[PDB]
Short mmCIF file of C-alpha atoms and ligand atoms in Angstrom, two decimals:
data_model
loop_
_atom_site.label_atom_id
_atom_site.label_comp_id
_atom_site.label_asym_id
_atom_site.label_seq_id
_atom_site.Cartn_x
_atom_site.Cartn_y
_atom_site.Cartn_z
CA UNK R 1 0.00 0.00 0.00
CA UNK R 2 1.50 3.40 -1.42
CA UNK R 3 0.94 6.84 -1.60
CA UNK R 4 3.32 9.73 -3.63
CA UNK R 5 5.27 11.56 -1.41
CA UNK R 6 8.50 13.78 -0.76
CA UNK R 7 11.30 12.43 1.73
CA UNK R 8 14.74 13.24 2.02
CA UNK R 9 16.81 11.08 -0.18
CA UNK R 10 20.36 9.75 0.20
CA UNK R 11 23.35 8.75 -2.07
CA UNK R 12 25.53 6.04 -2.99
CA UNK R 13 28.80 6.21 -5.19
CA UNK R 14 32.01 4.55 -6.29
CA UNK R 15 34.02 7.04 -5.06
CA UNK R 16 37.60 6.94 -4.22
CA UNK R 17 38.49 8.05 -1.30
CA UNK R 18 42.37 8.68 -2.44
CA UNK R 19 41.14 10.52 -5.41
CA UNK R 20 41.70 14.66 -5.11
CA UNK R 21 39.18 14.73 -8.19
CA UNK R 22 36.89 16.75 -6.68
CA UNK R 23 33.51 14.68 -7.49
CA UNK R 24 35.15 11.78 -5.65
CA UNK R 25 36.08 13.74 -2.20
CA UNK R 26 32.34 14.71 -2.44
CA UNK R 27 30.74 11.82 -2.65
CA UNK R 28 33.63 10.23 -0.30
CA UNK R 29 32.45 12.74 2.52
CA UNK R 30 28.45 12.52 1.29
CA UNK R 31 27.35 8.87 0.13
CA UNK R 32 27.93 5.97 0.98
CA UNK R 33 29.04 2.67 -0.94
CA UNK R 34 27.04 1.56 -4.34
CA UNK R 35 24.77 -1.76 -3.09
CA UNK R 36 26.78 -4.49 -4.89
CA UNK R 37 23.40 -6.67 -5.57
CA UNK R 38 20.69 -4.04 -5.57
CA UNK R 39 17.30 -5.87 -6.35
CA UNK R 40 14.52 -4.69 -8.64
CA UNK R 41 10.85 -5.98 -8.29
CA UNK R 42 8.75 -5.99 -11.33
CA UNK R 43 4.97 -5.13 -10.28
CA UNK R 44 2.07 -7.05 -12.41
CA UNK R 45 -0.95 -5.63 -13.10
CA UNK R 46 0.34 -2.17 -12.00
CA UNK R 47 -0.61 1.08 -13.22
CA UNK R 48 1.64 3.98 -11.72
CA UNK R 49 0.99 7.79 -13.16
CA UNK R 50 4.37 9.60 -13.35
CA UNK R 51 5.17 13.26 -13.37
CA UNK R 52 8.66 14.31 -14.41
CA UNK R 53 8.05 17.84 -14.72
CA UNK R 54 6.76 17.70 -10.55
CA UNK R 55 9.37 15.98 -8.76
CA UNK R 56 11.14 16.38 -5.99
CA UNK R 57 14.16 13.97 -6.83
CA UNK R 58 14.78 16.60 -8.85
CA UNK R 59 15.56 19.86 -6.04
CA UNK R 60 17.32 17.31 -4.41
CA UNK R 61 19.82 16.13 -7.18
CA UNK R 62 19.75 19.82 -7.61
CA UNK R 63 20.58 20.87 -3.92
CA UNK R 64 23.82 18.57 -4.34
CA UNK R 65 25.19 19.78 -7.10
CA UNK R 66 25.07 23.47 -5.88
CA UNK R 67 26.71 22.16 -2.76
CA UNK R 68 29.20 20.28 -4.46
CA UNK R 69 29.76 23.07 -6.75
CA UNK R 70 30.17 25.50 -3.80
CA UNK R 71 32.88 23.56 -2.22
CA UNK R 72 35.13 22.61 -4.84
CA UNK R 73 34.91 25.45 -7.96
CA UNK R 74 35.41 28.78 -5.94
CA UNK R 75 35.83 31.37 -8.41
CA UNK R 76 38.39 34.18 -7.53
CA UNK R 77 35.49 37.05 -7.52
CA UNK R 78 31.75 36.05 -6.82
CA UNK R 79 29.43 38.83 -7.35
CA UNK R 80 26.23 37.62 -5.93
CA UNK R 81 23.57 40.14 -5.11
CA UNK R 82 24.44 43.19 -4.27
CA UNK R 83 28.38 42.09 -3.02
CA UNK R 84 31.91 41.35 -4.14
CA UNK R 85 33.58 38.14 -2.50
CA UNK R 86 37.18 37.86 -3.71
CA UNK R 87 38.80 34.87 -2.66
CA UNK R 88 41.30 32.01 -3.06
CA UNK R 89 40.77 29.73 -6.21
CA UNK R 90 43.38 27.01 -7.62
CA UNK R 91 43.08 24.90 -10.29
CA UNK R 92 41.20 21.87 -9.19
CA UNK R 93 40.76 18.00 -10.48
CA UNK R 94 37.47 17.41 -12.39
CA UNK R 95 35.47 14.66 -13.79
CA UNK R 96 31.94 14.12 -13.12
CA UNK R 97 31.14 10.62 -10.99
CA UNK R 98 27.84 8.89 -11.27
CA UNK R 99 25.24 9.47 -8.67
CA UNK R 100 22.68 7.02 -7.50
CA UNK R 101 19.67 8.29 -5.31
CA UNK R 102 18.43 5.62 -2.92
CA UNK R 103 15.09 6.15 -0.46
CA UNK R 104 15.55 5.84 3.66
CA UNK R 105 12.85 3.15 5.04
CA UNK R 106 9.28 3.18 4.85
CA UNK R 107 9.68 4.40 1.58
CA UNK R 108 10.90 3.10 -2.16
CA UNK R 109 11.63 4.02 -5.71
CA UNK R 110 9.49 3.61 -8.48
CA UNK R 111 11.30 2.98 -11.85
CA UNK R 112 8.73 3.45 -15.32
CA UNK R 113 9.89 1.01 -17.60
CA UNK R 114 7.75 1.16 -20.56
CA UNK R 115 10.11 1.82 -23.36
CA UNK R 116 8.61 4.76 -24.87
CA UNK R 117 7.73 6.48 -21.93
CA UNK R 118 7.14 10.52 -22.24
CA UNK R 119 7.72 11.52 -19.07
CA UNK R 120 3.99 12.53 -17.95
CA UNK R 121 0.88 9.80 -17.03
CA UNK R 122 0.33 6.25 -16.86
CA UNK R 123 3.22 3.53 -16.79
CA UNK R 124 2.15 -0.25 -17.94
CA UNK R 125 5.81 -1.46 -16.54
CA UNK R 126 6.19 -0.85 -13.32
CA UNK R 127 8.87 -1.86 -10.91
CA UNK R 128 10.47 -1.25 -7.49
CA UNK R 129 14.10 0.04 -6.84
CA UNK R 130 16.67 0.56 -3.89
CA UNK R 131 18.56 3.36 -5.51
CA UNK R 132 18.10 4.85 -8.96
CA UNK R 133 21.21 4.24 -11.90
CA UNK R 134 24.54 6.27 -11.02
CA UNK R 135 23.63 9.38 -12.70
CA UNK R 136 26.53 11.81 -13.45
CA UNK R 137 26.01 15.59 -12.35
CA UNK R 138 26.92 17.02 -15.70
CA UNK R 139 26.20 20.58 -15.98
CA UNK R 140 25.97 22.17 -19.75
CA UNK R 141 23.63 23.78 -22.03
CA UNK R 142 21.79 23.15 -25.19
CA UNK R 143 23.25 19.39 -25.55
CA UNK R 144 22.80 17.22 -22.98
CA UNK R 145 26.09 15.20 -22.25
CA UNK R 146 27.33 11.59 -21.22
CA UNK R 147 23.54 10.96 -20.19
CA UNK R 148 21.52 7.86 -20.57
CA UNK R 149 20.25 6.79 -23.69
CA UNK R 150 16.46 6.28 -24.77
CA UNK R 151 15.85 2.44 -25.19
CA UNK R 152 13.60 2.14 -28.68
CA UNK R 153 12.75 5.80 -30.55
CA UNK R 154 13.57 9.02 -29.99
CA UNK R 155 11.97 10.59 -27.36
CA UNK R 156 10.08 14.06 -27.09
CA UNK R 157 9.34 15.46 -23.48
CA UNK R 158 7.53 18.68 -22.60
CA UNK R 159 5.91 19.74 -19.33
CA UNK R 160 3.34 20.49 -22.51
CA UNK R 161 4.34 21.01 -26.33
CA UNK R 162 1.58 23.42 -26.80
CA UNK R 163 3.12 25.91 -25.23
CA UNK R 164 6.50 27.59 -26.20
CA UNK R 165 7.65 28.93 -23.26
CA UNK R 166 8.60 25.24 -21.53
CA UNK R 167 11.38 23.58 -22.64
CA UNK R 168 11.57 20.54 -24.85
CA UNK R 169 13.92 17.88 -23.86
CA UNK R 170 14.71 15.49 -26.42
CA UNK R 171 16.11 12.15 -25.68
CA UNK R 172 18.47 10.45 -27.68
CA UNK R 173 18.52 6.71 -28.73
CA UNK R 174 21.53 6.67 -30.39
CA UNK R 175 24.32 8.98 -29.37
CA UNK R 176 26.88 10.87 -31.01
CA UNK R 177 30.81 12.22 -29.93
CA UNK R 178 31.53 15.60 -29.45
CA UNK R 179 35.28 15.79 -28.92
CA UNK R 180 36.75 19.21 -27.82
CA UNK R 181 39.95 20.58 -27.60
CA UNK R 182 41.79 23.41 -26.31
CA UNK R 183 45.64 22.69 -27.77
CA UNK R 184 48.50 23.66 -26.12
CA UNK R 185 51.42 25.61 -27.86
CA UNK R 192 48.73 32.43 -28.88
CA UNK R 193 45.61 32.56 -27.57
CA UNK R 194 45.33 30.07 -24.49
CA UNK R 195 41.28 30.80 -24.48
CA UNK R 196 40.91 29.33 -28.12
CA UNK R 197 39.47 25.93 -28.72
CA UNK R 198 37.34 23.64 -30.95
CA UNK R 199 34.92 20.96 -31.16
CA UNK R 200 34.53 18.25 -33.80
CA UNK R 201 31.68 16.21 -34.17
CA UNK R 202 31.19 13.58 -37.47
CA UNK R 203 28.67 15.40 -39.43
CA UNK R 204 27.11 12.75 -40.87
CA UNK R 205 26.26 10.83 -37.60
CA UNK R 206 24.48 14.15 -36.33
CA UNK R 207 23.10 14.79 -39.67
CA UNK R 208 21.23 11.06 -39.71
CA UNK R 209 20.14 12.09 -35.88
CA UNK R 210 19.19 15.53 -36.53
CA UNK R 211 16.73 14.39 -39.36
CA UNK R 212 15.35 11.54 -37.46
CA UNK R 213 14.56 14.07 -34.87
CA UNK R 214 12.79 16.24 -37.19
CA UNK R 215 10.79 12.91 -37.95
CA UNK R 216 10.11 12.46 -34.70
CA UNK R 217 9.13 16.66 -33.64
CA UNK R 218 6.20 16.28 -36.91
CA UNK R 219 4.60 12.93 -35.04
CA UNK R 220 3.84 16.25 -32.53
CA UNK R 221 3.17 19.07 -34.12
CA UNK R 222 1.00 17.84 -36.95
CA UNK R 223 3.04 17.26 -39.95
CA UNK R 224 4.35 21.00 -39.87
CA UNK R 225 7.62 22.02 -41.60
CA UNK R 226 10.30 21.42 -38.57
CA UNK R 227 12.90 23.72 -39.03
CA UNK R 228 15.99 24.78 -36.79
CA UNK R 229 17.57 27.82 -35.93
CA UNK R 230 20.32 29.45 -33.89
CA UNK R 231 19.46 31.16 -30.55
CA UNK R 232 17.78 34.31 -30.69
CA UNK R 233 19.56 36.41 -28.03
CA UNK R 234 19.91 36.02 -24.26
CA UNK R 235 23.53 35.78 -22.14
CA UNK R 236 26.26 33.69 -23.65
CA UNK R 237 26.05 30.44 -21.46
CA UNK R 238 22.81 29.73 -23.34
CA UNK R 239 23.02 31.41 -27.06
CA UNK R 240 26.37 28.37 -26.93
CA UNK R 241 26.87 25.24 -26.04
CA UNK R 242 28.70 25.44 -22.75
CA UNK R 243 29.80 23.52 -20.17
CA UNK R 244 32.76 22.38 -18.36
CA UNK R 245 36.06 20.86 -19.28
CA UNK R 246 38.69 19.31 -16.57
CA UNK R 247 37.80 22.88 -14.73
CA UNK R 248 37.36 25.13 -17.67
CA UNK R 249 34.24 26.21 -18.52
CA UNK R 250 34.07 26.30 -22.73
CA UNK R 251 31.60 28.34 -24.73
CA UNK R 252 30.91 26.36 -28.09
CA UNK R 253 29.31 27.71 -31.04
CA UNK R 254 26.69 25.25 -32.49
CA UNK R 255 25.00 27.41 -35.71
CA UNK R 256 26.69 24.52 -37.84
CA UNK R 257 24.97 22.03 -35.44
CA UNK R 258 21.57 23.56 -36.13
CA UNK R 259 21.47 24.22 -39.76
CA UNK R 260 18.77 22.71 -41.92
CA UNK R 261 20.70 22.60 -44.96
CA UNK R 262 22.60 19.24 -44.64
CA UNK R 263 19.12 17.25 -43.86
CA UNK R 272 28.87 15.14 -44.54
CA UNK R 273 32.21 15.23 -43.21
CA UNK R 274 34.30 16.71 -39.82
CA UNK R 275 31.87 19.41 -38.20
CA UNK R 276 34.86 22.04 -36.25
CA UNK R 277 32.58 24.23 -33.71
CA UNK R 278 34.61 27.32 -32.84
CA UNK R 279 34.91 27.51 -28.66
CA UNK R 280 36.34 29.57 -26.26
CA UNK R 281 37.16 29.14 -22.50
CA UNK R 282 35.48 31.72 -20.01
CA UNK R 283 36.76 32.63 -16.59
CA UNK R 284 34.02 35.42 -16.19
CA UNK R 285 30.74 33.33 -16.02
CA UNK R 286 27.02 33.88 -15.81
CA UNK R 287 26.46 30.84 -12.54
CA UNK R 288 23.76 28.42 -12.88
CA UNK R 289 23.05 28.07 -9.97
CA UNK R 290 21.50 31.82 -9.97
CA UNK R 291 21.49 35.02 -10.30
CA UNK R 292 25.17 35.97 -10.44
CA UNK R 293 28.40 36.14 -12.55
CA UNK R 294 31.77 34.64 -11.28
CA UNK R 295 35.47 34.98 -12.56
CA UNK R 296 37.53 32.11 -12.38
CA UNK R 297 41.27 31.66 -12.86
CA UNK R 298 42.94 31.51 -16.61
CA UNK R 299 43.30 27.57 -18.32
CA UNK R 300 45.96 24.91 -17.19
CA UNK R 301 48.65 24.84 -19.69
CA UNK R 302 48.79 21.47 -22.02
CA UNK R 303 45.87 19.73 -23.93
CA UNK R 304 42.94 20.05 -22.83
CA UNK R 305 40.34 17.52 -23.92
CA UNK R 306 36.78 16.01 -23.23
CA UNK R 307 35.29 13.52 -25.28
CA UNK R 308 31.25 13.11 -24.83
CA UNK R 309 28.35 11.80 -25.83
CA UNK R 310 25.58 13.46 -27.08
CA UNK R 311 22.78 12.23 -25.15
CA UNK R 312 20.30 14.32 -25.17
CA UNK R 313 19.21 17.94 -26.78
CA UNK R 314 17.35 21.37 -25.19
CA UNK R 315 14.86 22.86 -27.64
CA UNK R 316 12.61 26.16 -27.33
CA UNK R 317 10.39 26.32 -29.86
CA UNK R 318 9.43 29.75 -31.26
CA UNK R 319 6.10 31.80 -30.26
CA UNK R 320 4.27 33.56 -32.94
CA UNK R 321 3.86 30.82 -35.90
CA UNK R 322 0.37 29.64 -35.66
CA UNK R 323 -1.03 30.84 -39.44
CA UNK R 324 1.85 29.23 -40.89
CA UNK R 325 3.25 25.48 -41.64
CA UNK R 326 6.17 25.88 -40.11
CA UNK R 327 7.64 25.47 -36.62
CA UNK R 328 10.95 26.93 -35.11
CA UNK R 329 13.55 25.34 -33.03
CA UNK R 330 16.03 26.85 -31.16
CA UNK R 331 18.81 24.99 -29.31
CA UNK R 332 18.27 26.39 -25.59
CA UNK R 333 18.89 25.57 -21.53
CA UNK R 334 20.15 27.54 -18.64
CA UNK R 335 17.62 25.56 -16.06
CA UNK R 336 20.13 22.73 -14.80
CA UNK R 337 16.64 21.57 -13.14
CA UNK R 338 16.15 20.25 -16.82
CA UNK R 339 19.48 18.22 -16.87
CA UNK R 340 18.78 16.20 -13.85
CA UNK R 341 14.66 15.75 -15.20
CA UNK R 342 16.44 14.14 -18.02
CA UNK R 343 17.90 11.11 -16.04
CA UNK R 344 15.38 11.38 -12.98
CA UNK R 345 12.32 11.17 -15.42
CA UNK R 346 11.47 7.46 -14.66
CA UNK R 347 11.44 7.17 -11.09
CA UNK R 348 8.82 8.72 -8.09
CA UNK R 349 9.06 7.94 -4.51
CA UNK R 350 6.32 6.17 -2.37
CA UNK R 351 5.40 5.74 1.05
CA UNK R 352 5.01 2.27 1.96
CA UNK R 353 2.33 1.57 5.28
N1 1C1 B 401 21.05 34.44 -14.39
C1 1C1 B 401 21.89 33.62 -13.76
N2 1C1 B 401 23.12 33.97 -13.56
N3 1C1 B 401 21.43 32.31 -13.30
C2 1C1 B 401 20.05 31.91 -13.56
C3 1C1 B 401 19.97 30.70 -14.48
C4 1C1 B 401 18.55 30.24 -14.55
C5 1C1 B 401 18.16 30.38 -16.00
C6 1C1 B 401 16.83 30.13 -16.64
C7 1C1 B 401 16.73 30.33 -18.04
C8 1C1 B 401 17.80 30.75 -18.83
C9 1C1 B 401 19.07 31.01 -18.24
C10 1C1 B 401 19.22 30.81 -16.76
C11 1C1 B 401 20.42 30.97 -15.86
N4 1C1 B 401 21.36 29.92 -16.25
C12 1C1 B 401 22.77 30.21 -16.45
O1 1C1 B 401 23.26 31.19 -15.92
C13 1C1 B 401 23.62 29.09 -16.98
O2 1C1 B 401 23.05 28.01 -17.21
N5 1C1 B 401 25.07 29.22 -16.94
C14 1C1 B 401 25.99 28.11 -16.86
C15 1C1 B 401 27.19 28.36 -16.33
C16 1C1 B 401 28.23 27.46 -16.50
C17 1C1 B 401 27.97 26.28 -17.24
CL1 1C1 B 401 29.13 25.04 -17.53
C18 1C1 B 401 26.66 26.02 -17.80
F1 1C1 B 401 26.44 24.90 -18.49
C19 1C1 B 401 25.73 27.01 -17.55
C1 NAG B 402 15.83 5.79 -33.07
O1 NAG B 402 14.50 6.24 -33.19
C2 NAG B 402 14.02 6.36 -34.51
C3 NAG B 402 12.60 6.86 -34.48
O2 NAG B 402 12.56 8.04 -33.74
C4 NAG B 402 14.02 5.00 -35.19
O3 NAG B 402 13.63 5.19 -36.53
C5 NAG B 402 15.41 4.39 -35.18
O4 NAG B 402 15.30 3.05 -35.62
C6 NAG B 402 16.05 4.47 -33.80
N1 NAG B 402 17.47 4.27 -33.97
C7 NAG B 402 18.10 3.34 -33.26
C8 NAG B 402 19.58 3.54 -33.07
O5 NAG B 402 17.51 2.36 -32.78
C1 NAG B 403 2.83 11.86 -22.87
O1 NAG B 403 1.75 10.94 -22.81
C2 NAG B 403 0.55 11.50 -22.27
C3 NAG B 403 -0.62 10.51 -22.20
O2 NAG B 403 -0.16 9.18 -22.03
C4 NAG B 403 0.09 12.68 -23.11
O3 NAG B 403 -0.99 13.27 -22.43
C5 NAG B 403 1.20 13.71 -23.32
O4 NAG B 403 0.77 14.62 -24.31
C6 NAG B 403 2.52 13.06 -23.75
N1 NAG B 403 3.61 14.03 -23.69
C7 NAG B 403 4.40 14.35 -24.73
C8 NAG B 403 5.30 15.53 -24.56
O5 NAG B 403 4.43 13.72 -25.78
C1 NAG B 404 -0.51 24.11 -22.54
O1 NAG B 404 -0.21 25.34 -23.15
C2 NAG B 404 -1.28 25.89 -23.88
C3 NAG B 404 -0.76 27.13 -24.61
O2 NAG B 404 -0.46 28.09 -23.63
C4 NAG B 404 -2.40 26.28 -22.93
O3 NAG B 404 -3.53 26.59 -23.70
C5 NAG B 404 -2.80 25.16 -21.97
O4 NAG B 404 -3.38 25.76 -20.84
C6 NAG B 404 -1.63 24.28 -21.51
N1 NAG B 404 -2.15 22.97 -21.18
C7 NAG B 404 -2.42 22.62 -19.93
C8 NAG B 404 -2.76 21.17 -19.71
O5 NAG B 404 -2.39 23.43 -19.01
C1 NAG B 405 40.00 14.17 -30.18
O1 NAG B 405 40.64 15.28 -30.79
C2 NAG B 405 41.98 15.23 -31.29
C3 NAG B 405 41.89 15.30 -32.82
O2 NAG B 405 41.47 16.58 -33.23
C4 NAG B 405 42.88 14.05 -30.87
O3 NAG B 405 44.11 14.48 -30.29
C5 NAG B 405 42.20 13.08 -29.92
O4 NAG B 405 42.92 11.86 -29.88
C6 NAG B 405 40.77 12.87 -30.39
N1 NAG B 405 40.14 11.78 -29.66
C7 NAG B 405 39.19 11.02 -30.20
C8 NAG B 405 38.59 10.00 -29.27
O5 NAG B 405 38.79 11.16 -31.36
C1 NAG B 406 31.67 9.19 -39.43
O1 NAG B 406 30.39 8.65 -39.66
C2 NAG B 406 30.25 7.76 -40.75
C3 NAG B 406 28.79 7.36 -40.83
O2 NAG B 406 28.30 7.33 -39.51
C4 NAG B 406 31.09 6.53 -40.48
O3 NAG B 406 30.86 5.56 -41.48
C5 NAG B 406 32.55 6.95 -40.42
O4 NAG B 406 33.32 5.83 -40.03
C6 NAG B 406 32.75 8.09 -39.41
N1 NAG B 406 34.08 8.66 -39.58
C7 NAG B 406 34.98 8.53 -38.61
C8 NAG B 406 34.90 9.54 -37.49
O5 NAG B 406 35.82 7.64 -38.60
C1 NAG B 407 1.72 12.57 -41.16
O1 NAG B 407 1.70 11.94 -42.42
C2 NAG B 407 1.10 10.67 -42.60
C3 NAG B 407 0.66 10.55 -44.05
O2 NAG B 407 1.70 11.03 -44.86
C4 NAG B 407 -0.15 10.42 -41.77
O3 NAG B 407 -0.41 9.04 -41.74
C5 NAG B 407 -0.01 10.93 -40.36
O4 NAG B 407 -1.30 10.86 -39.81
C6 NAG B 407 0.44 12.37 -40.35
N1 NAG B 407 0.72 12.68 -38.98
C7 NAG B 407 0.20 13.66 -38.27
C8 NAG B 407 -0.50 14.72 -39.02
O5 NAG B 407 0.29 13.70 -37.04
C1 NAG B 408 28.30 31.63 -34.06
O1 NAG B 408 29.22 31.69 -35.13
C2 NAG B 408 28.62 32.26 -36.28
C3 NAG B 408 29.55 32.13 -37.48
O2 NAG B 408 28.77 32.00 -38.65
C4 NAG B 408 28.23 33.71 -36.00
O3 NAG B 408 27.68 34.31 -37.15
C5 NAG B 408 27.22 33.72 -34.85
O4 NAG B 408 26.82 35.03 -34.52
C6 NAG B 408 27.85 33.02 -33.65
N1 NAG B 408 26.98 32.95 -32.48
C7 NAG B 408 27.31 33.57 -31.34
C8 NAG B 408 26.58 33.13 -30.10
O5 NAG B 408 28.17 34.47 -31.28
C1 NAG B 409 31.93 12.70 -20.61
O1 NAG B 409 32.52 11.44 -20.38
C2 NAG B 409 33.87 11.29 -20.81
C3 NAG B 409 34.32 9.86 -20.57
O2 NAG B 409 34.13 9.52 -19.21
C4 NAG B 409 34.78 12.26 -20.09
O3 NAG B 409 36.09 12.15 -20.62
C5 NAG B 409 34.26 13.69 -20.22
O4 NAG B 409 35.02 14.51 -19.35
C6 NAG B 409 32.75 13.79 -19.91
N1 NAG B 409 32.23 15.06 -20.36
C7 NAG B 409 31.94 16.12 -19.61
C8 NAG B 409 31.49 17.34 -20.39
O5 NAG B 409 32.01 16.16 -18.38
#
């Protein structure tokens, strides 16, 4: 016997605790060890309604990552309402660890796993969990990155489509490497990102596929970012420390629907901060390479207001709620109270 509700959650991780990387000496000080034989139970005859655009799984995930992101990336000058904190800020160790979110007792985790699951309403597959996947904190904008993969199609997901102000999260099944570079010896801040154009070229159409099943046949077409700060008109996100700022108009250009795709980058140390309502400076890149390799998991579309008496509809690659990252992985799983 169940009802929906909101506890507080805990975490488990295979952290080491030698590591200085700074995800590891998180988790090493707040979770615990990964269950080594965690045990699923598959519930027949189940319905269970879902709603991925309403849970709390999702402020929590949320609350750690500001706190993790507080205690290991100071910037050198945080400017966060109405003061100026300059302080101390090396060069750390970086590379995202996954996560899992486990339930305390008297309570459990509900995992959807129908296989073409939206996100929103009733689940024919239901089961019961421990501890969600290991879910990596990865914090970027417009693509989602090093996510989990959709299991059959494409996936579409919208707190609701009809309207243009919520985000659309698309979900992969099938990703695709984005491998970025800042070489060592100029300009230190200068760096690149290639992707294989006709990989994304085959996704990007079967996308557009998939966006008409939803918006009635209508011409889908794709355009850059209309204005707004710099953390969301690029792809950024963060690189062994740096933050990079990619330019993605070659990403999101309906011609090609062939060979190396180069995105232009550059590495920021004064930042607009996700978490809110402030702009940080951090300290200038390592020397050497600098390199992350990722997959393309997922993407972060607005679509555009105003096209109603036409056959066309507008996307524009978007982001800049992190809430929407963590939705994408937390999407099939609600917490219960057991009696
Ligand atoms: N204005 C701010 N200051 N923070 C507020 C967030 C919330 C929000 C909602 C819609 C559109 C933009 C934003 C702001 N998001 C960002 O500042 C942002 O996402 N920046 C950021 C910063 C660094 C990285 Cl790696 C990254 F991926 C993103
Ligand atoms: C991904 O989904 C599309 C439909 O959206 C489907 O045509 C295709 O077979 C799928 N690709 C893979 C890798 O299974
Ligand atoms: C998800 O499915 C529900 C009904 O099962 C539907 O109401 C909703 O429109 C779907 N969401 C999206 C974004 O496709
Ligand atoms: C979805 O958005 C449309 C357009 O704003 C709006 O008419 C409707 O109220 C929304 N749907 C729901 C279920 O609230
Ligand atoms: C990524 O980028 C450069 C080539 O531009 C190269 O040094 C590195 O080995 C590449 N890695 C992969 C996995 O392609
Ligand atoms: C790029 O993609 C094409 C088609 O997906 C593939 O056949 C080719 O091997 C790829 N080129 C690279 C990066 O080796
Ligand atoms: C799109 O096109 C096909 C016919 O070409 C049709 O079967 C399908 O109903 C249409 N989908 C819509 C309008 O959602
Ligand atoms: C991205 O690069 C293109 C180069 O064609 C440029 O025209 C466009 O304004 C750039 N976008 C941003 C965010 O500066
Ligand atoms: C994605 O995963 C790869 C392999 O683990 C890693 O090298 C890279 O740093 C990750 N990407 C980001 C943006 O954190």
């Amino acid at each position: 016997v169940w009802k929906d509700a909101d506890t507080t959650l805990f975490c488990a991780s295979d952290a080491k605790a030698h590591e200085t990387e700074v995800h590891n000496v998180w988790a090493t000080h707040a979770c615990v060890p990964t269950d080594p034989n965690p045990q699923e139970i598959h519930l027949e005859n189940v319905t269970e309604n879902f709603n991925m655009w309403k849970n709390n799984m999702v402020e929590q995930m949320q609350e750690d990552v500001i706190s993790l992101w507080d205690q290991s990336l100071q910037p050198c000058v945080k400017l966060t309402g109405g003061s100026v904190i300059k302080q101390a800020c090396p060069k750390i160790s970086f590379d995202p660890i996954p996560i899992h979110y486990c339930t305390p007792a008297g309570y459990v985790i509900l995992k959807c796993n129908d296989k073409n699951f939206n996100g929103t309403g009733p689940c024919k597959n239901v089961s019961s969990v421990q501890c969600t996947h290991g879910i990596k904190p990865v914090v970027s904008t417009q693509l989602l990155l090093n996510g989990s993969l959709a299991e059959e199609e494409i996936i579409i997901r919208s707190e609701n489509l009809t309207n243009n102000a919520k985000t659309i999260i698309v979900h992969l099944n099938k990703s695709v490497e984005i491998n970025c570079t800042r070489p060592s010896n100029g300009d230190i801040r200068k760096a690149y990102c290639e992707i294989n154009g006709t990989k994304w070229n085959k996704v990007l159409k079967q996308v557009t596929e998939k966006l008409k099943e939803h918006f009635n046949n209508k011409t889908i077409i794709f355009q850059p970012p209309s204005g707004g700060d710099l953390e969301i008109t690029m792809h950024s996100f963060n690189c062994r420390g740096e933050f990079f700022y990619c330019n993605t108009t070659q990403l999101f250009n309906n011609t090609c629907i062939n060979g190396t795709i180069t995105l232009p980058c550059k590495i920021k140390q004064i930042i607009n901060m996700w978490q809110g309502t402030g702009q940080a400076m951090y300290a200038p890149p390592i020397d050497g390479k600098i390199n992350c390799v990722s997959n393309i998991t997922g993407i972060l579309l607005t679509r555009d207001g105003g096209a109603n008496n036409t056959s066309n509809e507008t996307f524009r690659p978007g982001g800049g709620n992190i809430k929407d990252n963590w939705r994408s992985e937390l999407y099939k799983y609600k917490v219960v109270q057991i009696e």
